[PDB]
Amino acid sequence: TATVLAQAIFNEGLRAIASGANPMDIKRGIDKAVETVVNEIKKLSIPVSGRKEIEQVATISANNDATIGKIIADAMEAVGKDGVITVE
Amino acid sequence: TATVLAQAIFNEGLRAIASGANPMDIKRGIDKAVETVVNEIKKLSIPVSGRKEIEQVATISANNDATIGKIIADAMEAVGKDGVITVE
Amino acid sequence: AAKKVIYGEDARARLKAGVDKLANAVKVTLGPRGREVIIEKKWGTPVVTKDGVTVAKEIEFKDPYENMGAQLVKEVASKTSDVAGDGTTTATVLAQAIFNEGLRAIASGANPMDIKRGIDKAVETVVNEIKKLSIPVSGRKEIEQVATISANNDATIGKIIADAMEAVGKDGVITVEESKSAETTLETVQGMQFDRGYLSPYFVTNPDKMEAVLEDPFILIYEKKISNVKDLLPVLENVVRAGKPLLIIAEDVEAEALATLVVNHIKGVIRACAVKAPGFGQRRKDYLQDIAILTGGTAITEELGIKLESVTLDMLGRADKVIVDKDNTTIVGGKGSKEAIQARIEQIKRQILETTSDYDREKLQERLAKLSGGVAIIRVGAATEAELKEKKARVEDAVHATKAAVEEGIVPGGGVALVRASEALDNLKVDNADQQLGIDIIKKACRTPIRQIAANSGFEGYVVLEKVLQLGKEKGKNWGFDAGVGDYKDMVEAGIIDPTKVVRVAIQNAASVAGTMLTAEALVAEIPE
Numbered sequence: 001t002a003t004v005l006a007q008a009i010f011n012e013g014l015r016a017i018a019s020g021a022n023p024m025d026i027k028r029g030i031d032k033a034v035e036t037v038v039n040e041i042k043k044l045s046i047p048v049s050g051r052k053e054i055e056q057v058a059t060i061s062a063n064n065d066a067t068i069g070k071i072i073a074d075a076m077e078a079v080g081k082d083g084v085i086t087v088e
Numbered sequence: 089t090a091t092v093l094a095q096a097i098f099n100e101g102l103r104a105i106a107s108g109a110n111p112m113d114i115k116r117g118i119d120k121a122v123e124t125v126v127n128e129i130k131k132l133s134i135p136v137s138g139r140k141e142i143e144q145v146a147t148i149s150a151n152n153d154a155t156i157g158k159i160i161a162d163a164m165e166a167v168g169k170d171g172v173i174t175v176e
Numbered sequence: 177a178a179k180k181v182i183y184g185e186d187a188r189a190r191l192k193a194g195v196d197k198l199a200n201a202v203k204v205t206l207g208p209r210g211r212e213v214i215i216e217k218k219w220g221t222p223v224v225t226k227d228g229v230t231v232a233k234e235i236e237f238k239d240p241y242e243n244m245g246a247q248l249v250k251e252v253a254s255k256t257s258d259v260a261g262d263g264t265t266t267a268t269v270l271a272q273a274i275f276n277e278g279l280r281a282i283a284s285g286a287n288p289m290d291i292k293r294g295i296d297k298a299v300e301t302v303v304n305e306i307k308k309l310s311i312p313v314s315g316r317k318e319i320e321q322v323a324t325i326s327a328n329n330d331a332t333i334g335k336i337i338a339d340a341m342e343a344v345g346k347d348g349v350i351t352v353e354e355s356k357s358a359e360t361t362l363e364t365v366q367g368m369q370f371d372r373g374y375l376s377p378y379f380v381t382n383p384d385k386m387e388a389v390l391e392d393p394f395i396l397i398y399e400k401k402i403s404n405v406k407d408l409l410p411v412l413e414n415v416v417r418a419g420k421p422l423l424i425i426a427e428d429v430e431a432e433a434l435a436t437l438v439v440n441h442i443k444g445v446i447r448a449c450a451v452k453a454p455g456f457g458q459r460r461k462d463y464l465q466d467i468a469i470l471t472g473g474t475a476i477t478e479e480l481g482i483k484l485e486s487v488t489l490d491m492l493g494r495a496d497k498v499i500v501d502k503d504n505t506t507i508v509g510g511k512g513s514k515e516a517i518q519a520r521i522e523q524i525k526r527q528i529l530e531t532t533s534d535y536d537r538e539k540l541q542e543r544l545a546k547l548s549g550g551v552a553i554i555r556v557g558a559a560t561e562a563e564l565k566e567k568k569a570r571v572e573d574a575v576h577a578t579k580a581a582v583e584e585g586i587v588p589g590g591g592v593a594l595v596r597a598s599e600a601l602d603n604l605k606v607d608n609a610d611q612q613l614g615i616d617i618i619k620k621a622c623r624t625p626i627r628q629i630a631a632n633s634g635f636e637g638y639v640v641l642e643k644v645l646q647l648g649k650e651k652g653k654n655w656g657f658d659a660g661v662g663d664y665k666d667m668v669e670a671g672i673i674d675p676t677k678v679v680r681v682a683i684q685n686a687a688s689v690a691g692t693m694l695t696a697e698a699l700v701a702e703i704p705e
């Protein structure tokens with residue numbers, strides 16, 4: 001996702017610069033927009049309640065693999081909040 | 089003048105297209121701009137008053153030659169406003 | 177001569193290169209807003225065109241094997257245009273789409289024979305759906321719309337063509353002729369024309385316009401010569417003592433006859449003129465009655481050809497308006513006996529139409545349409561002779577396309593008809609996986625021309641295609657995408673319609689040429705130089 005975003009910003013920035021815009025001011029405008037976006041993201045955030053969100057996050061990150069999500073959800077439950085999970 | 093203008097429009101048009109602009113939308117903007125420019129040209133123009141402006145135009149039309157401009161201006165005066173002038 | 181043969185995949189690769197090079201140049205001109213193609217003219221200014229037919233006519237490649245694919249598609253695409261008017265660029269676009277997708281399926285290991293069977297089955301389903309989607313032409317409104325779309329979206333040409341069909345009728349002929357006028361005009365003449373004109377130029381009444389129309393003519397058709405002084409003087413003296421304006425039609429021209437008439441015209445005694453001998457063979461009998469349609473007099477034939485003159489009360493021959501040109505004459509008016517010999521009009525409508533199956537209808541129409549009420553001539557005007565050339569050709573195609581629309585009906589334009597027809601391929605199923613691949617090849621191909629039109633106008637093709645598919649269920653089947661202005665609307669209501677014959681022939685012809693090239697195994701060409 002970060003690589004896709006980086007290409008999109010660079011491609012759109014080149015088009016704006018080709019129209020005669022100042023590159024330094026474009027960078028300043030980009031910095032201001034990201035601060036607003038990050039603040040809006042934090043407002044949209046939801047705290048993790050329990051095992052349901054943990055299993056759902058693990059399943060999605062594992063490319064929709066329910067078997068991996070169940071194991072990781074069990075692993076976090078056993079080790080608690082201060083535990084460390086290792087993959088071998 | 090037409091050759092100079094044609095190169096300027098073509099070179100700048102290719103630069104815009106190379107940056108990712110839609111060529112069809114570029115032509116629409118070019119057509120709209122030309123219509124505005126032509127209308128402003130008509131507003132800026134003034135009618136020819138008499139022999140003074142006719143002589144000036146003929147002089148500029150030639151290689152800035154006053155003798156040719158005077159001869160042409162006299163030809164229009166003698167012939168009239170609806171005759172023909174032949175170069176032999 | 178020594179020849180080089182290319183086998184198997186190498187042979188099809190050569191054809192693909194030739195087809196792609198031809199299609200890529202042609203397909204950019206598809207739609208009302210096609211891109212420009214610049215063609216070099218030797219020792220002259222380059223020609224800029226968006227026609228597509230003009231671009232295809234100039235395409236030829238040095239490589240004989242690549243030229244094989246280009247010429248094969250060009251010949252098939254031309255056949256589509258010849259039969260139904262438009263469809264040259266659409267057939268080329270469809271042929272490339274089917275061929276490219278077919279090669280990809282074969283490259284994956286599919287059976288080429290099974291692919292062709294699936295392609296044939298899909299085309300039959302698409303054609304049937306096209307017929308269901310078509311509607312009959314109602315009247316002048318749809319005829320004008322079809323003619324406008326058939327041309328370069330020109331309303332003036334569409335109006336002229338629609339008026340020509342209205343005046344001529346449902347079974348006549350419309351001719352497109354040369355001119356130098358600054359504007360295009362419509363010329364309509366009552367009666368019938370003749371393929372020949374002046375026998376002698378001395379008959380001309382006014383040299384400036386070179387016209388020698390005769391008022392209240394008394395024409396003398398002869399199935400015999402009857403052109404000597406002995407053969408004509410009793411005819412002449414009877415005409416002289418009657419004062420009837422003279423027209424002499426004979427088996428051939430005589431120097432003696434014209435010499436005395438030129439002298440007579442100089443003397444002014446007799447209103448003499450002649451149209452030599454138009455037609456050949458049994459065509460005379462039709463021509464004999466053609467004047468009898470209008471002058472109301474019996475034909476002289478050979479019965480009155482003998483005895484040196486019509487003695488009995490035969491061949492009144494009394495017209496009132498006859499036109500003459502260099503190689504053209506028109507008999508326009510007269511006292512009229514149309515209804516009496518309308519049985520022969522019924523006869524040719526009953527007999528010659530019955531024997532049309534031998535493909536002699538061109539001779540029948542060339543007789544029937546002239547024997548009909550009248551014909552109209554399209555007069556073409558442009559800036560340059562080169563500009564006059566392609567406009568004249570475009571008008572002829574628009575007339576042919578309009579005729580095809582009346583014959584079979586109309587369908588929504590802009591590639592919508594193929595998109596709607598391709599929707600029925602989703603439910604079509606076969607028991608063979610490879611035949612299923614051929615069905616999907618046609619479905620993708622049917623949705624290609626609409627994307628090309630959108631791409632040419634400056635829009636994303638796949639976005640337009642998705643919107644058109646959605647609008648089929650939300651609004652209706654006739655809803656599509658307009659390319660002149662970037663909005664979606666009802667194509668049938670907006671007047672952007674195409675003949676259903678054009679769509680039907682284009683898909684059938686494109687699939688036919690693509691199918692043969694898919695199974696081609698060898699290319700034989702002479703070694704250059």
Ligand SMILES: Nc1ncnc2c1ncn2[C@@H]1O[C@H](COP(=O)(O)OP(=O)(O)NP(=O)(O)O)[C@@H](O)[C@H]1O
Pocket residue numbers: 205206207208210227228229230257261262263264265266267325329588589590591629657658659660661672673674
């Ligand atoms: N305003 C329009 N909006 C959308 N599609 C249009 C419009 N006008 C015409 N078309 C479609 O564009 C196609 C005609 O474009 P054209 O480039 O003439 O194709 P062709 O008839 O196959 N080629 P040619 O034989 O050279 O006339 C048809 O499918 C028309 O239905």
Ligand SMILES: [K+]
Pocket residue numbers: 205206207208209210226227228
């Ligand atoms: K076009």
Ligand SMILES: [Mg+2]
Pocket residue numbers: 148149150
């Ligand atoms: Mg100058």
Ligand SMILES: [Mg+2]
Pocket residue numbers: 262263325326327
């Ligand atoms: Mg066309």
